[PDB]
Amino acid sequence: LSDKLKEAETRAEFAERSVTKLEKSIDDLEDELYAQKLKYKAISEELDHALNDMTSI
Amino acid sequence: GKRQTEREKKKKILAERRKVLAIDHLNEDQLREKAKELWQSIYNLEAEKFDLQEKFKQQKYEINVLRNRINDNQ
Amino acid sequence: DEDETTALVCDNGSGLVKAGFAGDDAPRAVFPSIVGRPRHQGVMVGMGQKDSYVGDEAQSKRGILTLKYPIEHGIITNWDDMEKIWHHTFYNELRVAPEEHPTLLTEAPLNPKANREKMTQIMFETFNVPAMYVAIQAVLSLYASGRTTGIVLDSGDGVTHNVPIYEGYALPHAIMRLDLAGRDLTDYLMKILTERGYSFVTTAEREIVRDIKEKLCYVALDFENEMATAASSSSLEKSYELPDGQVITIGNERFRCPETLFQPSFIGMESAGIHETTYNSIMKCDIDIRKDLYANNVMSGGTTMYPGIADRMQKEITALAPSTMKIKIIAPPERKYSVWIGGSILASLSTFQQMWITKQEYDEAGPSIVHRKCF
Amino acid sequence: DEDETTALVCDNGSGLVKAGFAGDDAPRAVFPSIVGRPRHQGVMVGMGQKDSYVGDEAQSKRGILTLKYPIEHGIITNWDDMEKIWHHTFYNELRVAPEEHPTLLTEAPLNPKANREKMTQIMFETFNVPAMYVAIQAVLSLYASGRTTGIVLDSGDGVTHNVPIYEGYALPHAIMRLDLAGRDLTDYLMKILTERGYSFVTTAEREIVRDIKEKLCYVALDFENEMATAASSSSLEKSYELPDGQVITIGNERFRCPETLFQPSFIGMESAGIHETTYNSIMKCDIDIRKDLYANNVMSGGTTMYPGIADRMQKEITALAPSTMKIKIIAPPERKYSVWIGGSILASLSTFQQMWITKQEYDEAGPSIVHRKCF
Amino acid sequence: DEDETTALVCDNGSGLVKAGFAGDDAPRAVFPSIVGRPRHQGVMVGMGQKDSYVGDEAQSKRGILTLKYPIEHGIITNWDDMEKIWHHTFYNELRVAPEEHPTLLTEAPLNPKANREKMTQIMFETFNVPAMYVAIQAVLSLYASGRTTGIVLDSGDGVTHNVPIYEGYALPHAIMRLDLAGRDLTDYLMKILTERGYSFVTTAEREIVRDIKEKLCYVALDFENEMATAASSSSLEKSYELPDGQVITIGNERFRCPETLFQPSFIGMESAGIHETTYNSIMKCDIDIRKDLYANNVMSGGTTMYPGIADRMQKEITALAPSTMKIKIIAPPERKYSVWIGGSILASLSTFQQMWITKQEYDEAGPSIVHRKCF
Ligand SMILES: Nc1ncnc2c1ncn2[C@@H]1O[C@H](COP(=O)(O)OP(=O)(O)O)[C@@H](O)[C@H]1O
Ligand SMILES: Nc1ncnc2c1ncn2[C@@H]1O[C@H](COP(=O)(O)OP(=O)(O)O)[C@@H](O)[C@H]1O
Numbered sequence A: 001l002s003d004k005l006k007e008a009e010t011r012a013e014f015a016e017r018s019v020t021k022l023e024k025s026i027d028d029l030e031d032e033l034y035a036q037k038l039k040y041k042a043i044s045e046e047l048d049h050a051l052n053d054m055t056s057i
Numbered sequence B: 001g002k003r004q005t006e007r008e009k010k011k012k013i014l015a016e017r018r019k020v021l022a023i024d025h026l027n028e029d030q031l032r033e034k035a036k037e038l039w040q041s042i043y044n045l046e047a048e049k050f051d052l053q054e055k056f057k058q059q060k061y062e063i064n065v066l067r068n069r070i071n072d073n074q
Numbered sequence C, D, E: 001d002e003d004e005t006t007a008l009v010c011d012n013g014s015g016l017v018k019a020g021f022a023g024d025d026a027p028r029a030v031f032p033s034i035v036g037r038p039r040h041q042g043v044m045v046g047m048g049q050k051d052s053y054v055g056d057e058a059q060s061k062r063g064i065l066t067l068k069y070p071i072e073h074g075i076i077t078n079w080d081d082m083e084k085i086w087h088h089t090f091y092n093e094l095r096v097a098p099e100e101h102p103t104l105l106t107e108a109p110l111n112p113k114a115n116r117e118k119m120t121q122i123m124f125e126t127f128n129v130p131a132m133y134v135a136i137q138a139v140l141s142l143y144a145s146g147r148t149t150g151i152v153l154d155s156g157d158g159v160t161h162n163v164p165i166y167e168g169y170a171l172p173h174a175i176m177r178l179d180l181a182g183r184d185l186t187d188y189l190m191k192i193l194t195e196r197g198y199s200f201v202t203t204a205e206r207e208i209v210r211d212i213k214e215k216l217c218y219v220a221l222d223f224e225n226e227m228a229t230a231a232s233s234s235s236l237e238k239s240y241e242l243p244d245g246q247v248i249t250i251g252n253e254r255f256r257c258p259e260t261l262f263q264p265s266f267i268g269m270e271s272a273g274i275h276e277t278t279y280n281s282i283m284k285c286d287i288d289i290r291k292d293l294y295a296n297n298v299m300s301g302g303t304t305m306y307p308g309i310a311d312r313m314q315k316e317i318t319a320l321a322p323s324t325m326k327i328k329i330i331a332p333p334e335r336k337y338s339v340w341i342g343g344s345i346l347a348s349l350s351t352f353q354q355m356w357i358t359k360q361e362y363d364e365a366g367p368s369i370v371h372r373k374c375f
């Protein structure tokens, strides 16, 4: 039973480290995705102003 | 590890003699006489120190004397 | 025991021999690559006169037997140990003779010609084998991964191979082998533990600390920050219980042991870390496929069983390469056996049954010609 | 030491720096292009605090100093190494300051603009030099050859330039540079020797095997036939004695090392061999002068010191071109220094003394305008 | 007694403490590293109540005092013995306080961190010392040798260190310590003398036989041949006269005692002999400098005072290494004190006077930071 308990402790230590790394990676990927979305919408606003002046021609 | 504790005890031995002082329950006149007892403690302390100093000097002469004996019967 | 005439897949990887029949999903006979030699001479009567232990028989007794590694950095040192480990695997575990089925062996990339000719000669002349075949590990690992693109990083015990394969295409010019792996990490942990205070200088303890590393040692996500926060340790240091009972206390050393891979300067070698060498290899490839190599990088080897390698690789590559593209790193579960698994799925094809090398053609051609035929 | 106000000819060729005063027939200060950095940090007291070795001082100690190449393929990687090698050549060997005589430097064909502007700026702003001049190597080599017609093949250490000049006329459109030279040959020999069995992965051994190649490696007159006759070797394989004493045995590999030049496919590059690229360059020229280019082809570069290049070139060109005309290939003795020799005979003319670029006009014009003035 | 404000060089080597002022050529206070402790309790009145003897005071009386070794294999066992030996050296022989001059101590390579922090704390907190410095023995020995290249073999009493230094460059990765030295040789001689017939099991006799070994025991030039010719002894066996008067007769055992160094199997350890370990260390170094390490090998330690070590080393290395180069072994006279001598010449430099560690910075930083500053 001591061997089994030590095996379980290592298994969960591994799974918990995996949990923390996956959560950190998820947070980072969300940050990247929505920053990129913001950049896309910003260049969209640039196109909006550009078309407005082009109509102003 | 006990030697580190020995140095810690050296500081702890200096620490033991000092105790918290309370100036809130005392009035104007009593504090003065209490200051005087603190002063006498100071006096007392230096006296013993002085003694030690003089003894130290004496002891050093002893050492010197002792050394000569081993240099005369070798 | 076996009713199918199929090749025996025997992965003789450095540190662990994994043998089993083709078609299986995992090796049945898994034992370390070690040979135990009787050190002294006993006047006792009745014990086994066997002069050469192997495998679990040697692992069970490491205090009496001087331990010798049958493979070093990749180059085969002693051939008697080779004959011992194959003869043992054949006539002690599998309970089958090699005279009835083929044998698909797996060798490391960029190995000496003497090694290949020697093993082939022992497998043809001495043992009567109908057919042999040498295969590189990286291809079989990519097979088991279920893809055709990516750079396989195989970190065994004494050698580390980086092999790029894009669209099912090998690149023999870019394969660069570097002898940094589990043995140099065991040596680094041993010298730093000797620095801690517990000094040992025998191989049995070395194997014990190797097992301790396999069980506990992990990779750090930020080396210097972990050093600072471990200066005042609380939960960062762990107290391990030796199988003998002696209470060992190991703190930061864990996540500083594999760090030697990222900083070879610790062992005073001008070689670059595994990540930097892989990055340089990517520059050596063409630009067109570099993004695909970034998106399909695969890992192999037992050394990759440590927790925290994927994240460390991602941060290091992101710091080295631009951060505009997408650089996903994929590590298939049970990657260590994946190589062997590949062997199994490679031995069931009829075409592969047509690509074997029989005895007669080898005998007339000779071993060197056989080397030309394979590549 | 010098009583004549003449430019210092300093050929900074890739792999070997050759510096000397104008008028001489050979460079006095010849040292490899390498920079040795202290790898570790010593607690020792008294040794030179110098943090940057160079030249023979680095060659004498290659085990302690990590070696970095100051030039790669042609593009200058680090400028600190540039300042180090010139400052060393000025204040350690020649024992003369650049503030008293000009300096005729030689640069490779088709080099980056950043390289030229950088070296010119270090030679004008930092060091006080009365006048600078950049010159292409091919023209000076053709000068030293004593002709005005032919195609110069300059094979340095990391780059190979084919430059056609007919009747003294340069062709900046046909100059094609290809980064195949001595370093890629050293890498090929290293990987094939690792295939033989002796594996190394450090730069000091790389330089040692480079020297071994320079001394022994030659070009084959018939690759496949030599392969067949070397299969059963007797006098074809030679046993070399390493300067350390280890007995190395090298057979066919020698005459298969430079063969990579003729078959770039060995390094997995779509580029064509040096002979085929030269042949294509000849087609790119006009037909009228093609025969003259066939009859006046000249070679340059240290890599051409191998025995058997002239015959191999003759057979390959005869197999590619018709065999009706006459295709004589001329290689002047001591061709490697010939370039530098040219510099010497180019710095003694009064007209060339009138074609220098003084500080003031460069300062007002700026470096870019200086680039326009030269070409 | 001392009119110069210079550091006291106190080499606390295992087995013999050698203390003296800087500038001298030999230690004035030389005494064994032993602590004699009152075993019984006496009802007598008038004798010294001192509860802890040290040095010659303990050597003069070994029958009453149980002897304890203050150092074992390198790791400090008891710190009270440390405080005893320094306090004794300060206030019984040198007749000088540590509050007036620095102190340059010498420690063994690859020692525990606890040892260093402990000695530094006893030298700063308890004793008021203006400045401390820890130094490795190998560097000072190479200094006293008057060179900058070679591999120092320091064989003390309970530990043996092989330290390669080429062109004044330490190699902390190659330093390998092995606990085979004079104590294990004394134990081997004791058990083989017990096998001869004279059995003893007390430490005083152990020290006596240690002295007998130091005086008589030598190294053999050919072990098996000496065994054969000693089978019929005549002049090969010698009759020694014990200081007590008992007539001891010792024959071949002499030149078989240090042989255990060359064959650790005698003590049932898988470790390799000192010569084979040094040879392996040489392979671990780079090839370029290996010849220089062969030509500049230096020895240190009291154990090297036996006659016949140089020749044995030469034959063993010649049998192991090739016999084409030149392998000269140099042993400077009075090598044992050379280390200490180095200390003296190291404490007279003004720069070294600038590399000391004062109390205040250590107190704020703490001992661990001090460890980082030194290395
Ligand atoms: N379960 C494990 N956990 C951690 N490390 C391991 C494990 N199994 C093997 N290793 C390490 O991997 C190395 C051996 O790998 P190897 O068996 O050669 O991989 P492969 O068989 O994929 O080539 C050894 O250095 C060992 O320390
Ligand atoms: N004596 C020699 N024998 C063979 N090869 C040489 C020799 N000297 C130089 N080389 C090769 O030439 C290259 C360097 O040529 P380099 O000095 O740039 O020629 P150049 O100075 O004419 O431009 C290196 O790769 C080196 O291997």
Ligand SMILES: Nc1ncnc2c1ncn2[C@@H]1O[C@H](COP(=O)(O)OP(=O)(O)O)[C@@H](O)[C@H]1O
Pocket (backbone or CB within 6 Å): E011, E013, E014, E015, E016, E154, E155, E156, E157, E158, E181, E182, E183, E210, E213, E214, E215, E300, E301, E302, E303, E304, E305, E306, E335, E336, E337, E339
């Ligand atoms: N004069 C001598 N002759 C033979 N052996 C000696 C002598 N002096 C010391 N030794 C041996 O050397 C060991 C102690 O060496 P040590 O004093 O530590 O050398 P170092 O001071 O150079 O480190 C002991 O085992 C002792 O047996």
Ligand SMILES: [Mg+2]
Pocket (backbone or CB within 6 Å): C013, C154, C155, C156, C157, C300, C301, C302
């Ligand atoms: Mg592996």
Ligand SMILES: [Mg+2]
Pocket (backbone or CB within 6 Å): D013, D154, D155, D156, D157, D300, D301, D302
């Ligand atoms: Mg050239």
Ligand SMILES: [Mg+2]
Pocket (backbone or CB within 6 Å): E013, E154, E155, E156, E157, E300, E301, E302
């Ligand atoms: Mg010693």
